[PDB]
Amino acid sequence: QITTGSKELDKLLQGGIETGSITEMFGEFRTGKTQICHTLAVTCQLPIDRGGGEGKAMYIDTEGTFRPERLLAVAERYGLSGSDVLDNVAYARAFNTDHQTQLLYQASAMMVESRYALLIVDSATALYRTDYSGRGELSARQMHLARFLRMLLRLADEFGVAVVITNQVVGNIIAHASTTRLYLRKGRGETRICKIYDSPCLPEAEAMFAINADGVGDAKD
Amino acid sequence: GPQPISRLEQCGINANDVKKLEEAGFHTVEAVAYAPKKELINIKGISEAKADKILAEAAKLVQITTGSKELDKLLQGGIETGSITEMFGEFRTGKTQICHTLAVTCQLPIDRGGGEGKAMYIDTEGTFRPERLLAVAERYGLSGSDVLDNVAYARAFNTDHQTQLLYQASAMMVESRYALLIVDSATALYRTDYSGRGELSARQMHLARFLRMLLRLADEFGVAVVITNQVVGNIIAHASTTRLYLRKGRGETRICKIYDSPCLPEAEAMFAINADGVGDAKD
Amino acid sequence: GPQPISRLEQCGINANDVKKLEEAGFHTVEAVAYAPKKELINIKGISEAKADKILAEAAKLVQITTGSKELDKLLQGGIETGSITEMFGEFRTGKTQICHTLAVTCQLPIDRGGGEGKAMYIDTEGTFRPERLLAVAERYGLSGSDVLDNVAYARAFNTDHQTQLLYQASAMMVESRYALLIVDSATALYRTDYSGRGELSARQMHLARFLRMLLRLADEFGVAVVITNQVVGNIIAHASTTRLYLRKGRGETRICKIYDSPCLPEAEAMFAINADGVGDAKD
Numbered sequence: 036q037i038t039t040g041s042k043e044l045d046k047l048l049q050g051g052i053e054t055g056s057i058t059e060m061f062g063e064f065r066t067g068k069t070q071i072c073h074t075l076a077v078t079c080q081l082p083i084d085r086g087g088g089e090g091k092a093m094y095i096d097t098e099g100t101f102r103p104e105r106l107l108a109v110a111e112r113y114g115l116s117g118s119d120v121l122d123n124v125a126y127a128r129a130f131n132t133d134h135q136t137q138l139l140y141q142a143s144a145m146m147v148e149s150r151y152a153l154l155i156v157d158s159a160t161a162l163y164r165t166d167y168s169g170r171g172e173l174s175a176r177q178m179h180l181a182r183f184l185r186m187l188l189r190l191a192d193e194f195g196v197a198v199v200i201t202n203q204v205v206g207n208i209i210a211h212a213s214t215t216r217l218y219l220r221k222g223r224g225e226t227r228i229c230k231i232y233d234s235p236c237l238p239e240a241e242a243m244f245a246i247n248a249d250g251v252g253d254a255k256d
Numbered sequence: 257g258p259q260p261i262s263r264l265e266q267c268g269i270n271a272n273d274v275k276k277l278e279e280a281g282f283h284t285v286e287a288v289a290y291a292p293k294k295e296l297i298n299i300k301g302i303s304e305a306k307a308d309k310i311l312a313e314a315a316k317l318v319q320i321t322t323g324s325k326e327l328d329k330l331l332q333g334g335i336e337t338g339s340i341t342e343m344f345g346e347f348r349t350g351k352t353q354i355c356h357t358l359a360v361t362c363q364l365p366i367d368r369g370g371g372e373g374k375a376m377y378i379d380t381e382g383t384f385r386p387e388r389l390l391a392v393a394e395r396y397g398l399s400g401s402d403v404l405d406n407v408a409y410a411r412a413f414n415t416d417h418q419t420q421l422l423y424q425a426s427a428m429m430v431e432s433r434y435a436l437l438i439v440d441s442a443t444a445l446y447r448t449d450y451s452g453r454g455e456l457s458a459r460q461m462h463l464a465r466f467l468r469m470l471l472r473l474a475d476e477f478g479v480a481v482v483i484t485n486q487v488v489g490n491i492i493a494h495a496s497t498t499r500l501y502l503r504k505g506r507g508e509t510r511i512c513k514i515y516d517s518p519c520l521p522e523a524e525a526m527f528a529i530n531a532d533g534v535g536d537a538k539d
Numbered sequence: 540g541p542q543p544i545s546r547l548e549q550c551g552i553n554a555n556d557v558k559k560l561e562e563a564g565f566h567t568v569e570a571v572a573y574a575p576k577k578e579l580i581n582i583k584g585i586s587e588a589k590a591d592k593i594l595a596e597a598a599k600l601v602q603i604t605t606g607s608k609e610l611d612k613l614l615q616g617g618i619e620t621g622s623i624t625e626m627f628g629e630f631r632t633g634k635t636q637i638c639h640t641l642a643v644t645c646q647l648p649i650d651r652g653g654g655e656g657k658a659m660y661i662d663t664e665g666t667f668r669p670e671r672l673l674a675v676a677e678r679y680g681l682s683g684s685d686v687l688d689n690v691a692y693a694r695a696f697n698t699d700h701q702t703q704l705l706y707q708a709s710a711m712m713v714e715s716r717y718a719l720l721i722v723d724s725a726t727a728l729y730r731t732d733y734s735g736r737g738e739l740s741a742r743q744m745h746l747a748r749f750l751r752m753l754l755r756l757a758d759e760f761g762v763a764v765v766i767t768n769q770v771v772g773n774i775i776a777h778a779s780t781t782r783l784y785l786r787k788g789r790g791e792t793r794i795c796k797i798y799d800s801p802c803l804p805e806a807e808a809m810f811a812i813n814a815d816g817v818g819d820a821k822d
Binding site for chain 3: 346348448449486507529
């Protein structure tokens with residue numbers, strides 16, 4: 036299983052995210068989903084005993100919030116090389132949903148040629164909400180996302196990746212196909228509150244985490 | 257530097273289609289490998305099967321002073337080389353003079369508030385002025401005649417060549433150490449070129465390509481990128497590594513505010529505009 | 540520098556299509572090389588393949604005194620050469636006389652608040668006479684007869700004919716230095732032709748292309764553009780680089796406000812209208 040980079044959130048996940056599974060997180064604006072995912076992007080490279088996956092991360096960014104220096108800091112926290120971490124976190128920003136789905140093809144085709152532990156899709160719904168913002172064409176956006184989600188599940192079996200996706204609330208289409216969902220709340224400080232929203236296999240319990248200097252970790256409060 | 261698209265011929269694509277890619281301005285294999293199949297398919301005779309081959313075979317290969325100490329102190333030293341910055345506000349709040357000051361000063365040593373290199377001035381609005389460039393050059397001690405060319409120039413008058421100039425830079429911006437790129441009134445062409453309210457999806461998808469190439473160039477050559485936005489959106493707030501609002505007082509008195517950033521707090525600084533470019537709020 | 544469309548014909552486009560570009564407002568390669576296909580396709584008789592050929596072939600190629608020192612001091616020197624500036628105002632504000640003043644004074648030495656060149660005077664309204672210019676010229680010390688030659692006059696009754704007079708400007712403005720470009724009651728031919736409520740989108744498109752023509756010409760030749768407008772559209776309030784509001788002060792004395800300008804101060808100045816043109820008020 037692959038570590039979220041919090042011992043608490045992993046013990047809530049009964050050891051971390053599964054190789055061969057989809058999981059999601061959502062919450063309020065500026066709750067650090069990218070910093071959880073930047074941690075995951077390094078930690079999936081680790082030995083499996085560390086909650087590792089001994090393989091690369093895909094970083095399907097939607098929003099341009101990816102930076103090398105956060106990955107350098109997370110790398111040296113785990114004792115990994117920062118430049119190995121940059122070489123192990125494949126980056127390109129999907130500017131639209133078609134580009135997000137094409138980046139599942141870039142991911143999968145080149146993942147025949149290399150071992151990935153993880154796929155990140157960061158603010159995934161923002162592209163669906165900016166290419167198809169209006170109520171006029173919802174079945175096209177939704178079936179383009181149903182394709183994208185089948186492809187996530189297909190990749191998770193085809194290459195063994197854990198798949199993590201990140202979402203915005205002030206949709207319900209993912210609630211059955213996902214194997215666990217997380218809710219993030221707005222606790223005080225750079226410390227934040229995490230809870231399992233639902234899981235068919237895990238407790239509805241809580242974990243406390245923080246944005247540290249070295250990405251997301253367990254709360255050091 | 258990048259893998260130039262000429263090499264893709266050794267990877268397998270016929271040289272005629274590689275020249276049709278270079279005529280699309282797609283002068284690097286990297287500068288297509290990070291983009292969707294549509295942008296290749298849209299090139300005449302380069303079909304779906306040729307875009308499949310192009311991208312499969314591509315994997316064989318793939319701080320500047322504003323002239324104001326106070327505005328540079330809002331910028332925590334001035335514009336960082338290897339970034340996008342955006343400033344937005346009403347007409348004449350400063351855009352053209354901000355750009356003319358930065359386009360010169362990027363040629364300075366980094367310690368003197370530079371980026372150690374050339375500028376590109378993608379002028380959407382025809383407000384390039386040699387007089388104004390020379391006034392900054394003689395103030396900051398740069399060669400005035402060389403400033404007129406080290407500020408490499410073209411007027412843009414649709415978003416397409418505003419953007420295809422970034423693909424021309426996928427050649428030209430290899431050829432020296434550009435410190436800077438300016439697109440001046442960058443958003444205005446998305447408002448002139450797609451103005452009927454049945455046409456807005458074309459503004460969106462074309463703006464995505466533009467902002468993609470800006471941040472690419474910032475990663476590919478280490479340029480700072482400055483984009484100036486007219487007022488009388490959130491995708492540009494994403495692409496801009498920090499955002500800025502421009503305002504005014506009586507006289508030529510100006511204020512800037514940081515309004516969006518994952519890295520910097522919301523903060524404000526006071527400045528002015530002078531016969532010798534952008535400067536501090538002196539009296 | 541500027542990019543004239545007189546280069547396009549020799550590439551393979553027939554001269555009468557280049558004349559349709561000029562008479563539609565695309566006076567320049569700086570209006571057809573970097574432009575959307577739809578804008579070329581909208582012109583009478585020009586096909587999509589001819590728009591393609593126009594683009595492919597063009598891609599082979601590529602302050603004045605108002606006469607009142609107080610209103611000029613509000614303008615921090617006067618009307619800017621190489622800009623659009625709009626004045627809009629109430630009934631009997633004498634707007635033609637402001638225009639006849641500017642038409643004379645643009646010919647003067649720049650240090651006198653001149654412009655060192657001719658004016659175009661596109662008319663909509665028949666308020667011009669040669670006599671108006673004669674009595675103005677003799678204040679500023681210009682010859683009244685040469686002032687008529689320096690104020691190229693024609694009236695339009697419709698906005699196509701008016702656009703054709705901007706074609707006459709675009710061709711003839713190469714033969715002498717123009718400092719100014721007047722269109723007197725510029726909005727009024729849109730109001731005569733497009734009074735039908737539903738036609739506002741076609742007025743806005745025709746007027747937007749016309750405002751661009753004025754801007755290209757200002758960028759091509761360094762002309763100030765002066766356009767006079769009527770109080771009971773808002774496209775001119777941001778297509779002009781600063782807006783001026785005229786009200787009915789007492790007698791021929793009229794109040795000006797800088798109604799919006801994030802650079803020039805948004806204050807007021809008082810001026811009189813005379814046979815000698817616009818001057819400062821005396822009590």
